[PDB]
Short mmCIF file of C-alpha atoms and ligand atoms in Angstrom, two decimals:
data_model
loop_
_atom_site.label_atom_id
_atom_site.label_comp_id
_atom_site.label_asym_id
_atom_site.label_seq_id
_atom_site.Cartn_x
_atom_site.Cartn_y
_atom_site.Cartn_z
CA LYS A 5 307.21 -2.63 23.10
CA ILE A 6 305.41 0.61 22.18
CA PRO A 7 304.43 2.71 25.21
CA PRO A 8 300.92 2.21 26.60
CA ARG A 9 298.17 4.74 25.86
CA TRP A 10 300.19 6.01 22.87
CA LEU A 11 298.11 4.75 19.93
CA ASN A 12 295.03 6.76 20.96
CA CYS A 13 297.03 9.86 21.94
CA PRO A 14 296.83 12.81 19.53
CA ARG A 15 300.17 13.44 17.85
CA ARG A 16 300.24 17.19 18.52
CA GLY A 17 298.32 19.98 20.20
CA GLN A 18 297.84 23.61 19.35
CA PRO A 19 300.85 25.90 19.75
CA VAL A 20 301.11 27.52 23.18
CA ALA A 21 301.88 31.26 23.47
CA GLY A 22 302.75 31.17 19.77
CA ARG A 23 306.05 29.49 20.59
CA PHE A 24 305.72 25.91 21.88
CA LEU A 25 304.34 22.90 20.01
CA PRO A 26 303.57 20.10 22.50
CA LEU A 27 303.87 16.56 21.13
CA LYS A 28 303.78 12.95 22.09
CA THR A 29 306.96 11.05 21.32
CA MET A 30 307.58 10.03 17.74
CA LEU A 31 308.12 6.35 16.99
CA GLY A 32 310.57 5.40 14.28
CA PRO A 33 310.13 2.76 11.57
CA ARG A 34 311.59 0.25 14.03
CA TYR A 35 308.08 0.04 15.55
CA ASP A 36 306.17 -0.35 12.26
CA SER A 37 305.36 -4.00 13.03
CA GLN A 38 303.56 -2.87 16.21
CA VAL A 39 301.85 0.26 14.82
CA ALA A 40 299.27 0.26 12.04
CA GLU A 41 299.82 2.73 9.21
CA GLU A 42 297.00 5.04 10.31
CA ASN A 43 298.58 5.42 13.78
CA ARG A 44 302.22 5.99 12.78
CA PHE A 45 304.15 9.09 13.92
CA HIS A 46 307.58 8.89 12.27
CA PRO A 47 309.68 12.07 12.69
CA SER A 48 309.35 12.52 8.94
CA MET A 49 305.62 13.09 9.47
CA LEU A 50 306.29 16.03 11.80
CA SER A 51 308.89 17.59 9.52
CA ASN A 52 306.70 17.10 6.43
CA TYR A 53 303.71 18.74 8.14
CA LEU A 54 305.83 21.73 9.16
CA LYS A 55 307.18 21.98 5.60
CA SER A 56 303.64 21.84 4.20
CA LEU A 57 302.78 24.85 6.37
CA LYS A 58 306.11 26.62 5.53
CA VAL A 59 306.91 26.61 9.26
CA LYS A 60 310.33 25.92 10.75
CA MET A 61 311.00 24.27 14.10
CA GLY A 62 314.07 25.82 15.69
CA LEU A 63 314.47 23.25 18.45
CA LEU A 64 312.99 19.95 19.62
CA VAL A 65 313.22 19.19 23.35
CA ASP A 66 313.06 15.48 24.21
CA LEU A 67 311.97 14.80 27.81
CA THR A 68 311.67 11.00 27.63
CA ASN A 69 315.09 10.09 29.14
CA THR A 70 315.49 7.44 26.42
CA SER A 71 316.74 6.97 22.86
CA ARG A 72 314.69 3.83 22.09
CA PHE A 73 311.75 5.66 20.46
CA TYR A 74 313.28 7.26 17.35
CA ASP A 75 316.52 8.37 15.69
CA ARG A 76 317.55 11.92 16.58
CA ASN A 77 319.28 12.18 13.20
CA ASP A 78 315.85 12.17 11.54
CA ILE A 79 315.29 15.51 13.31
CA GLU A 80 318.80 16.92 13.01
CA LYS A 81 319.13 16.24 9.26
CA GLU A 82 316.23 18.67 8.72
CA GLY A 83 318.09 21.54 10.40
CA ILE A 84 316.19 21.23 13.70
CA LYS A 85 318.31 21.37 16.83
CA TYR A 86 317.76 18.33 19.04
CA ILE A 87 318.26 18.31 22.82
CA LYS A 88 317.66 15.40 25.19
CA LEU A 89 316.80 17.05 28.52
CA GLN A 90 316.96 14.54 31.36
CA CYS A 91 314.22 15.09 33.95
CA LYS A 92 313.76 13.78 37.48
CA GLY A 93 312.56 10.18 37.50
CA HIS A 94 310.54 8.15 40.00
CA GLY A 95 307.38 9.91 38.83
CA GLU A 96 308.32 13.21 40.47
CA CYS A 97 307.73 16.49 38.67
CA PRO A 98 310.75 18.26 37.14
CA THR A 99 313.09 19.88 39.64
CA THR A 100 313.88 23.58 39.79
CA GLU A 101 317.21 22.62 38.21
CA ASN A 102 315.36 20.91 35.34
CA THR A 103 313.19 23.99 34.83
CA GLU A 104 316.24 26.27 34.84
CA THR A 105 317.91 24.04 32.25
CA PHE A 106 314.78 24.14 30.08
CA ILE A 107 314.51 27.93 30.38
CA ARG A 108 318.22 28.46 29.66
CA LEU A 109 317.92 26.30 26.55
CA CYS A 110 314.67 27.77 25.22
CA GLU A 111 315.50 31.45 25.77
CA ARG A 112 318.21 31.09 23.10
CA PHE A 113 315.58 30.38 20.43
CA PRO A 119 309.34 33.17 14.02
CA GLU A 120 309.93 29.46 14.62
CA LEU A 121 308.36 26.84 16.88
CA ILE A 122 309.94 24.91 19.75
CA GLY A 123 308.76 21.32 19.90
CA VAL A 124 308.46 19.76 23.35
CA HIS A 125 307.63 16.11 23.96
CA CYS A 126 307.63 13.47 26.66
CA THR A 127 306.26 9.95 26.15
CA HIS A 128 302.66 11.20 25.93
CA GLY A 129 303.09 14.99 25.79
CA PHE A 130 301.01 16.10 28.79
CA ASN A 131 302.67 16.18 32.21
CA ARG A 132 306.40 16.89 31.87
CA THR A 133 305.77 18.82 28.65
CA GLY A 134 303.07 21.00 30.18
CA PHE A 135 304.97 21.48 33.43
CA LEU A 136 308.03 22.84 31.64
CA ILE A 137 305.99 24.92 29.17
CA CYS A 138 304.00 26.55 31.98
CA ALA A 139 307.19 27.18 33.96
CA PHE A 140 308.68 28.96 30.96
CA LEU A 141 305.49 30.97 30.44
CA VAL A 142 305.49 32.19 34.04
CA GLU A 143 309.21 32.82 34.56
CA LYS A 144 310.12 34.23 31.13
CA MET A 145 306.93 35.52 29.47
CA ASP A 146 305.31 36.94 32.65
CA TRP A 147 302.17 34.81 32.43
CA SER A 148 300.10 33.99 35.46
CA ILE A 149 300.23 30.31 36.39
CA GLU A 150 296.43 30.16 36.16
CA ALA A 151 296.55 31.38 32.56
CA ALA A 152 299.42 29.04 31.65
CA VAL A 153 297.69 25.95 33.06
CA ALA A 154 294.34 26.84 31.48
CA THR A 155 295.88 27.57 28.08
CA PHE A 156 297.84 24.31 28.06
CA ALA A 157 294.69 22.47 29.13
CA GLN A 158 292.82 23.93 26.17
CA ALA A 159 295.63 23.36 23.63
CA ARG A 160 296.48 19.73 24.34
CA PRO A 161 293.28 18.49 25.99
CA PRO A 162 293.45 18.85 29.80
CA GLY A 163 297.18 19.32 29.45
CA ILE A 164 298.33 18.34 32.94
CA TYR A 165 296.41 15.54 34.66
CA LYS A 166 298.80 14.63 37.50
CA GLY A 167 297.56 16.34 40.66
CA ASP A 168 300.99 16.72 42.25
CA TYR A 169 302.27 18.46 39.11
CA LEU A 170 299.52 21.09 39.34
CA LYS A 171 300.08 21.46 43.09
CA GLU A 172 303.82 22.01 42.62
CA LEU A 173 303.25 24.51 39.81
CA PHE A 174 300.95 26.53 42.07
CA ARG A 175 303.36 26.21 45.00
CA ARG A 176 306.22 27.60 42.91
CA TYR A 177 304.29 30.29 41.03
CA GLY A 178 301.02 31.00 42.85
CA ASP A 179 298.97 29.91 45.87
CA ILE A 180 299.15 26.16 46.47
CA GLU A 181 295.72 26.23 48.13
CA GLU A 182 294.25 27.44 44.81
CA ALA A 183 295.73 24.60 42.75
CA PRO A 184 292.98 22.97 40.65
CA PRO A 185 292.21 19.27 41.00
CA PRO A 186 293.31 17.05 38.12
CA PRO A 187 290.77 17.00 35.28
CA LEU A 188 288.47 14.09 34.65
CA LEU A 189 289.98 12.05 31.87
CA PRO A 190 288.40 11.30 28.48
CA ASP A 191 287.38 7.76 27.58
CA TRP A 192 290.19 7.19 25.06
CA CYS A 193 292.83 7.23 27.81
CA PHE A 194 292.08 3.67 28.95
CA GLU A 195 290.92 1.82 25.82
CA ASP A 196 294.03 -0.40 25.80
CA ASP A 197 294.19 -1.29 29.51
CA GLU A 198 293.14 -4.91 29.01
CA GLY A 229 277.94 -4.26 26.21
CA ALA A 230 275.49 -1.82 24.66
CA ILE A 231 273.31 -4.67 23.38
CA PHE A 232 271.22 -6.14 26.20
CA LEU A 233 270.29 -9.41 24.50
CA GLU A 234 271.92 -10.49 21.24
CA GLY A 235 269.47 -11.10 18.40
CA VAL A 236 266.26 -9.99 20.16
CA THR A 237 264.97 -6.48 20.83
CA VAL A 238 263.55 -6.14 24.32
CA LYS A 239 261.06 -3.54 25.56
CA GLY A 240 261.33 -1.67 28.85
CA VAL A 241 265.07 -2.44 28.99
CA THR A 242 267.28 0.60 28.41
CA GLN A 243 270.99 0.76 29.24
CA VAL A 244 272.07 3.00 32.12
CA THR A 245 274.84 5.43 31.19
CA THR A 246 273.73 8.14 33.64
CA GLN A 247 276.94 8.82 35.57
CA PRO A 248 275.31 9.25 39.03
CA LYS A 249 273.17 6.09 39.18
CA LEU A 250 275.54 3.78 37.24
CA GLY A 251 278.30 3.83 39.84
CA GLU A 252 275.67 3.45 42.55
CA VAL A 253 274.14 0.26 41.11
CA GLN A 254 277.62 -1.19 40.55
CA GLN A 255 278.63 -0.19 44.09
CA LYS A 256 275.61 -1.83 45.70
CA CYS A 257 276.24 -5.06 43.79
CA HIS A 258 279.88 -5.02 44.95
CA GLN A 259 278.88 -4.51 48.58
CA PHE A 260 276.20 -7.21 48.40
CA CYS A 261 278.70 -9.74 47.06
CA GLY A 262 281.64 -8.74 49.27
CA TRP A 263 283.71 -8.14 46.13
CA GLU A 264 287.04 -6.44 46.83
CA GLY A 265 288.25 -5.88 43.27
CA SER A 266 286.68 -3.97 40.42
CA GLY A 267 284.43 -5.63 37.86
CA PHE A 268 281.51 -8.03 37.75
CA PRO A 269 281.15 -9.66 41.20
CA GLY A 270 279.23 -12.79 40.19
CA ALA A 271 280.53 -16.33 40.61
CA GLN A 272 282.50 -17.72 37.67
CA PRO A 273 282.22 -21.45 36.90
CA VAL A 274 285.19 -23.23 35.34
CA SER A 275 285.22 -25.89 32.64
CA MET A 276 285.34 -29.51 33.78
CA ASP A 277 288.51 -31.50 33.11
CA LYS A 278 289.74 -34.90 34.26
CA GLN A 279 291.06 -33.27 37.45
CA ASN A 280 287.82 -31.34 38.09
CA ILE A 281 285.39 -34.26 37.98
CA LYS A 282 286.92 -35.94 41.05
CA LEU A 283 285.39 -33.07 43.06
CA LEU A 284 281.90 -34.50 42.51
CA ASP A 285 282.77 -37.28 44.98
CA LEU A 286 284.10 -35.02 47.74
CA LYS A 287 280.92 -33.09 48.71
CA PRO A 288 277.21 -32.70 47.84
CA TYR A 289 276.49 -31.24 44.42
CA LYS A 290 273.41 -30.27 42.42
CA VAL A 291 273.11 -30.35 38.64
CA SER A 292 271.10 -28.43 36.07
CA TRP A 293 271.02 -28.23 32.30
CA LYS A 294 272.83 -25.17 31.00
CA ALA A 295 270.98 -23.30 28.31
CA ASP A 296 273.29 -21.06 26.31
CA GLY A 297 272.42 -17.62 27.66
CA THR A 298 273.73 -14.26 28.82
CA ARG A 299 274.77 -13.97 32.47
CA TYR A 300 272.84 -11.27 34.34
CA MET A 301 272.57 -10.36 37.99
CA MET A 302 269.34 -8.52 38.82
CA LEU A 303 269.33 -5.92 41.61
CA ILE A 304 265.87 -5.09 42.97
CA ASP A 305 266.41 -1.87 44.92
CA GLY A 306 262.94 -0.30 45.04
CA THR A 307 259.75 0.49 43.17
CA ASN A 308 260.91 1.12 39.60
CA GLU A 309 264.53 0.34 40.54
CA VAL A 310 265.15 -2.94 38.72
CA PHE A 311 268.56 -3.35 37.11
CA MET A 312 270.42 -6.02 35.15
CA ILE A 313 274.21 -6.37 35.22
CA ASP A 314 276.16 -8.42 32.70
CA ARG A 315 279.72 -9.74 32.87
CA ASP A 316 281.05 -6.39 31.60
CA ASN A 317 279.49 -4.50 34.59
CA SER A 318 277.13 -2.78 32.11
CA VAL A 319 273.83 -1.80 33.72
CA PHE A 320 270.30 -1.95 32.29
CA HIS A 321 267.16 -0.43 33.81
CA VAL A 322 264.00 -2.55 33.58
CA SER A 323 260.74 -0.63 33.96
CA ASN A 324 257.62 -2.78 34.30
CA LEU A 325 259.04 -5.72 36.28
CA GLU A 326 257.23 -5.86 39.63
CA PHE A 327 258.60 -7.78 42.64
CA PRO A 328 256.04 -7.68 45.48
CA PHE A 329 256.92 -8.33 49.12
CA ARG A 330 255.63 -11.75 50.21
CA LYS A 331 253.96 -10.58 53.43
CA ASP A 332 252.61 -7.24 52.13
CA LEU A 333 251.42 -7.75 48.56
CA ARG A 334 251.08 -3.98 48.09
CA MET A 335 254.68 -3.27 49.12
CA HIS A 336 257.75 -3.71 46.93
CA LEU A 337 261.13 -5.36 47.39
CA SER A 338 264.34 -3.51 48.28
CA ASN A 339 267.99 -4.50 48.77
CA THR A 340 267.60 -7.76 46.82
CA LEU A 341 270.25 -9.26 44.53
CA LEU A 342 269.69 -12.13 42.08
CA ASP A 343 271.77 -14.15 39.64
CA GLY A 344 270.92 -16.04 36.48
CA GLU A 345 270.88 -16.14 32.70
CA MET A 346 268.78 -14.43 30.05
CA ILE A 347 267.73 -17.12 27.57
CA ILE A 348 265.87 -16.97 24.26
CA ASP A 349 262.86 -19.27 24.06
CA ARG A 350 261.20 -19.84 20.68
CA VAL A 351 257.40 -19.98 20.57
CA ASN A 352 257.21 -20.72 16.88
CA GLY A 353 257.24 -17.61 14.72
CA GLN A 354 258.68 -15.37 17.45
CA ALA A 355 261.42 -15.57 20.09
CA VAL A 356 260.41 -14.80 23.69
CA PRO A 357 262.98 -13.60 26.26
CA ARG A 358 263.19 -15.49 29.56
CA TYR A 359 265.22 -14.73 32.70
CA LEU A 360 266.03 -17.83 34.74
CA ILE A 361 266.92 -17.06 38.36
CA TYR A 362 269.52 -19.67 39.29
CA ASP A 363 270.77 -18.11 42.55
CA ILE A 364 270.03 -15.31 45.02
CA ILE A 365 272.69 -13.34 46.87
CA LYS A 366 270.70 -11.07 49.20
CA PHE A 367 267.09 -10.52 50.24
CA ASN A 368 265.84 -7.43 52.13
CA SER A 369 269.49 -7.03 53.27
CA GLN A 370 269.42 -10.57 54.74
CA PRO A 371 272.58 -12.41 53.61
CA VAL A 372 270.74 -15.33 52.04
CA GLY A 373 273.87 -16.00 49.97
CA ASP A 374 275.59 -17.26 53.13
CA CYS A 375 272.87 -19.89 53.61
CA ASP A 376 272.65 -23.34 52.02
CA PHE A 377 272.10 -23.56 48.27
CA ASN A 378 268.85 -25.40 48.97
CA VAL A 379 267.85 -22.65 51.42
CA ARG A 380 268.49 -20.09 48.67
CA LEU A 381 266.64 -22.14 46.05
CA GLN A 382 263.66 -22.13 48.41
CA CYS A 383 264.18 -18.40 48.99
CA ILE A 384 263.91 -17.85 45.23
CA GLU A 385 260.82 -20.05 44.87
CA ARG A 386 258.89 -18.86 47.92
CA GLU A 387 259.93 -15.19 48.23
CA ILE A 388 260.30 -14.19 44.56
CA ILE A 389 258.31 -16.37 42.17
CA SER A 390 255.33 -16.89 44.49
CA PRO A 391 254.56 -13.26 45.48
CA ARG A 392 254.65 -12.32 41.79
CA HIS A 393 252.52 -15.35 40.90
CA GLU A 394 249.82 -14.36 43.40
CA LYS A 395 249.19 -11.02 41.68
CA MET A 396 249.40 -12.86 38.33
CA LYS A 397 246.04 -14.54 39.04
CA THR A 398 244.50 -11.38 40.54
CA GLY A 399 244.75 -9.28 37.37
CA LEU A 400 246.79 -6.69 39.27
CA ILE A 401 249.87 -7.88 37.34
CA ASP A 402 249.67 -8.40 33.56
CA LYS A 403 252.41 -10.63 32.16
CA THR A 404 251.85 -9.32 28.61
CA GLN A 405 252.95 -5.88 29.84
CA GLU A 406 256.25 -7.03 31.37
CA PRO A 407 259.56 -6.88 29.45
CA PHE A 408 260.33 -10.61 29.79
CA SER A 409 259.35 -13.84 31.53
CA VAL A 410 260.87 -14.42 34.98
CA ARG A 411 261.39 -18.04 36.06
CA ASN A 412 263.73 -20.01 38.31
CA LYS A 413 266.12 -22.73 37.17
CA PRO A 414 265.39 -26.25 38.48
CA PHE A 415 268.18 -28.17 40.21
CA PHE A 416 268.48 -31.91 40.83
CA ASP A 417 270.85 -34.38 42.44
CA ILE A 418 273.74 -35.79 40.39
CA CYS A 419 272.06 -39.21 40.52
CA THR A 420 269.37 -37.83 38.19
CA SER A 421 272.03 -35.91 36.23
CA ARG A 422 272.99 -39.30 34.81
CA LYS A 423 269.42 -39.56 33.49
CA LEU A 424 269.75 -36.03 32.12
CA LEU A 425 272.54 -37.51 29.98
CA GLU A 426 270.29 -40.41 28.90
CA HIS A 435 264.92 -24.65 27.22
CA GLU A 436 267.57 -26.27 25.03
CA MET A 437 270.84 -27.18 26.73
CA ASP A 438 274.39 -27.06 25.41
CA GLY A 439 275.77 -28.72 28.55
CA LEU A 440 275.46 -29.24 32.30
CA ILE A 441 276.36 -27.23 35.39
CA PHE A 442 277.30 -28.72 38.77
CA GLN A 443 276.59 -26.49 41.78
CA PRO A 444 278.07 -27.22 45.21
CA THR A 445 275.62 -26.84 48.08
CA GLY A 446 277.85 -24.47 50.05
CA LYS A 447 277.58 -20.74 50.56
CA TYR A 448 277.71 -18.29 47.67
CA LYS A 449 281.17 -17.27 46.57
CA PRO A 450 282.08 -14.42 44.21
CA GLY A 451 284.84 -14.53 41.65
CA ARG A 452 286.37 -17.70 40.29
CA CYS A 453 284.81 -20.81 41.82
CA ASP A 454 287.04 -23.84 41.24
CA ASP A 455 284.15 -25.98 42.52
CA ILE A 456 281.36 -24.82 40.19
CA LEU A 457 281.82 -27.11 37.19
CA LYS A 458 280.60 -26.41 33.66
CA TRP A 459 280.63 -29.55 31.55
CA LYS A 460 280.36 -29.01 27.80
CA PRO A 461 280.67 -31.51 24.93
CA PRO A 462 284.28 -31.08 23.82
CA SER A 463 283.50 -29.76 20.32
CA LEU A 464 281.38 -26.87 21.68
CA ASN A 465 284.22 -25.32 23.73
CA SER A 466 284.69 -21.66 22.77
CA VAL A 467 286.54 -18.53 23.92
CA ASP A 468 285.78 -14.82 23.46
CA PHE A 469 288.78 -12.89 22.11
CA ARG A 470 289.46 -9.26 21.33
CA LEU A 471 290.38 -9.41 17.63
CA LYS A 472 293.44 -7.26 16.84
CA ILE A 473 294.02 -7.63 13.11
CA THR A 474 297.61 -6.90 12.02
CA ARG A 475 298.06 -7.25 8.26
CA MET A 476 301.56 -8.61 7.64
CA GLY A 477 303.84 -9.81 4.87
CA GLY A 478 304.10 -13.39 6.09
CA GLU A 479 305.56 -15.34 3.17
CA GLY A 480 306.93 -12.05 1.86
CA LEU A 481 306.12 -11.99 -1.84
CA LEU A 482 302.44 -12.65 -1.25
CA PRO A 483 301.46 -10.50 1.77
CA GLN A 484 300.22 -13.18 4.17
CA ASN A 485 298.16 -11.10 6.60
CA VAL A 486 297.56 -12.63 10.03
CA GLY A 487 295.18 -11.46 12.74
CA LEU A 488 295.71 -12.03 16.45
CA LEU A 489 293.59 -12.63 19.56
CA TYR A 490 293.58 -11.12 23.05
CA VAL A 491 292.26 -12.01 26.51
CA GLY A 492 291.67 -9.89 29.59
CA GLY A 493 294.50 -9.56 32.08
CA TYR A 494 297.20 -10.75 29.66
CA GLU A 495 299.21 -8.07 27.88
CA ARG A 496 300.59 -10.06 24.93
CA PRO A 497 298.31 -11.98 22.55
CA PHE A 498 296.91 -15.21 23.95
CA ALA A 499 297.01 -16.76 20.47
CA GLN A 500 296.66 -15.89 16.78
CA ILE A 501 294.21 -16.51 13.93
CA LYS A 502 294.21 -16.56 10.13
CA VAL A 503 293.06 -13.32 8.53
CA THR A 504 290.11 -13.68 6.17
CA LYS A 505 288.13 -11.15 4.15
CA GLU A 506 285.02 -11.97 6.19
CA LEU A 507 287.10 -11.52 9.36
CA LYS A 508 288.28 -7.93 8.84
CA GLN A 509 284.57 -7.10 9.23
CA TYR A 510 284.84 -7.46 13.02
CA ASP A 511 288.17 -5.84 13.93
CA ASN A 512 288.91 -4.38 17.38
CA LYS A 513 285.57 -6.08 18.17
CA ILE A 514 284.94 -9.25 20.21
CA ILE A 515 284.66 -12.65 18.49
CA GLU A 516 283.65 -16.05 19.86
CA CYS A 517 285.90 -18.81 18.52
CA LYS A 518 285.61 -22.58 18.66
CA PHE A 519 288.80 -24.66 18.72
CA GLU A 520 289.31 -27.31 16.05
CA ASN A 521 292.00 -28.65 13.72
CA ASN A 522 294.76 -26.95 15.78
CA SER A 523 293.34 -23.50 14.98
CA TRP A 524 290.97 -20.99 16.48
CA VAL A 525 287.97 -20.78 14.16
CA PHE A 526 285.60 -17.83 14.02
CA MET A 527 282.01 -18.91 14.57
CA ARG A 528 279.99 -15.80 15.54
CA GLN A 529 280.66 -12.22 16.57
CA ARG A 530 279.68 -11.25 20.11
CA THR A 531 277.78 -7.95 20.19
CA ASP A 532 276.93 -8.01 23.92
CA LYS A 533 280.51 -8.15 25.27
CA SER A 534 282.68 -5.04 25.46
CA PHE A 535 285.36 -7.31 26.96
CA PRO A 536 286.92 -10.67 26.08
CA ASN A 537 287.31 -13.67 28.34
CA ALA A 538 289.84 -13.41 31.15
CA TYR A 539 293.24 -15.00 30.63
CA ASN A 540 292.41 -17.44 33.43
CA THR A 541 289.08 -18.36 31.82
CA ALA A 542 290.82 -18.88 28.46
CA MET A 543 293.49 -21.06 30.06
CA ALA A 544 290.72 -23.03 31.77
CA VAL A 545 289.08 -23.67 28.39
CA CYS A 546 292.42 -24.77 26.92
CA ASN A 547 293.02 -27.08 29.90
CA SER A 548 289.60 -28.55 29.17
CA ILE A 549 290.14 -29.08 25.44
CA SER A 550 293.60 -30.65 25.81
CA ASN A 551 292.51 -32.89 28.73
CA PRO A 552 288.81 -33.38 28.01
CA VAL A 553 285.98 -35.24 29.70
CA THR A 554 284.03 -37.23 27.12
CA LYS A 555 280.29 -37.74 27.52
CA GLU A 556 280.76 -41.44 28.28
CA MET A 557 283.41 -40.69 30.91
CA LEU A 558 281.14 -38.25 32.76
CA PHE A 559 278.27 -40.75 32.44
CA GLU A 560 280.34 -43.55 33.97
CA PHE A 561 281.67 -41.28 36.71
CA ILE A 562 278.16 -40.29 37.80
CA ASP A 563 276.56 -43.74 37.51
CA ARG A 564 278.51 -45.83 40.02
O1 GTP B 601 317.99 -1.62 32.65
C1 GTP B 601 316.88 -1.15 33.38
C2 GTP B 601 316.69 -1.97 34.65
O2 GTP B 601 317.72 -2.92 34.78
C3 GTP B 601 316.74 -0.95 35.79
N1 GTP B 601 315.61 -1.13 36.72
C4 GTP B 601 314.35 -0.62 36.58
N2 GTP B 601 313.62 -0.99 37.65
C5 GTP B 601 314.40 -1.73 38.48
C6 GTP B 601 314.16 -2.35 39.69
O3 GTP B 601 313.05 -2.28 40.22
N3 GTP B 601 315.18 -3.05 40.32
C7 GTP B 601 316.42 -3.12 39.73
N4 GTP B 601 317.40 -3.79 40.32
N5 GTP B 601 316.65 -2.50 38.52
C8 GTP B 601 315.66 -1.82 37.90
O4 GTP B 601 316.66 0.33 35.19
C9 GTP B 601 317.13 0.26 33.87
C10 GTP B 601 316.44 1.30 32.99
O5 GTP B 601 316.13 2.47 33.73
P1 GTP B 601 314.85 3.33 33.25
O6 GTP B 601 315.30 4.67 32.74
O7 GTP B 601 314.13 2.56 32.17
O8 GTP B 601 313.86 3.51 34.51
P2 GTP B 601 312.46 4.24 34.18
O9 GTP B 601 312.72 5.60 33.57
O10 GTP B 601 311.67 3.38 33.24
O11 GTP B 601 311.63 4.38 35.55
P3 GTP B 601 310.31 5.31 35.53
O12 GTP B 601 310.67 6.72 35.11
O13 GTP B 601 309.36 4.72 34.52
O14 GTP B 601 309.65 5.33 36.89
#
């Protein structure tokens, strides 16, 4: 497999001290099936560039401790000396012995000296700076700064910088590691608030100070240990799920197809929406008055629900259904009974707003969207629900609120409407071999390899590296609609849950006859 974070890494930086050309590792043609043409870095590319500039490379120093990336003969056949310099492993910075070896080698060799590790930043910069200080009489400050400016923030491991300053300067003056650019983490695993409608007063929060704060407060309100969206995740009903409806009290509601959003009400104009991607949106003119003091405003409140699109003919009106509440005025309402929290919603959220809605002090035609609560019923009447618009049903246990995956919150969906959000990675291939049968692939969060594949189409290349919602039918994933509001695909566990559902489904009649008797 190609190394991580390599596709987005620049191939080369600017020459350092007029002598050293820092590089990421080349990848030979053996990796062409994993690397698109625009991202390829064969050794021939480096030699051809140098030839185009009438520049010779005297020596190439390989710091990767491996021969699996490319063929050294591709370098040596061009008259470039190749040396594989083994460096200390276990993540430690190069030893004094490694630096002496590097200096002894390089002082033998106007022509450039190429230096590369897997990515071309930490080992490469460490050795280059060591040479600059020991042999060219640079200050370590100047060496580190110059390498940072040549290959962007050249050394980003803090212990590397600390050791460089310990060897060549004052360790107490070692700089902290630089903040990393966004491209570093694009391969580790949405700007549109609501898809299809444009919504006033709602503007995404990218301000670095307040973004982390809103996310942090939501984490702490939910008791969420990991990173990411803290809200409860329902799982698709299968023939082994439905038996849970007999084992404890449950409430049902129709599921409109909508966009999950927690709403944090932290102050006066502090109203924020959070989607599954952890993206934050600031809402301006939504007012949440305190029940007891109608002049005062709510703080430390956390909600949960969907944003749905209602159609009042000729125009589509946004609506935000509140279908749970996590915290209220710092009171852990989420630990109370689901009926207690439904009443908390109704009596402490909808009612104080609806008092000032008949006083003229609150104008609903000023507000960004309509705020309602989702009705819940007993399963008994769910049967009648099977006898605004809903694409399925949701079954809520009456227990306390739980973040993360909830095996006991059941989404039932008619089997033909099951869908999964994939990250589309299109990889044009030869396939048959005479006719180039190109085939795109699909990805899920938390799984490194592809979850499955898809057939490449001309209409499909349109959304590439994007997110696509796919229905399953005819033993193939089928594109149905692009998803503009997700920067992230479904989790591997969510995708496997959907597959478990489709291969062991619950038909409408079966759910009907389970509920009835
Ligand atoms: O053949 C591999 C592999 O068998 C062996 N290896 C790596 N990790 C372990 C381990 O935790 N336990 C055992 N028993 N064996 C292990 O190492 C061989 C390859 O060595 P590498 O050079 O690839 O080690 P690497 O440089 O990748 O480590 P690092 O520099 O990324 O930290």
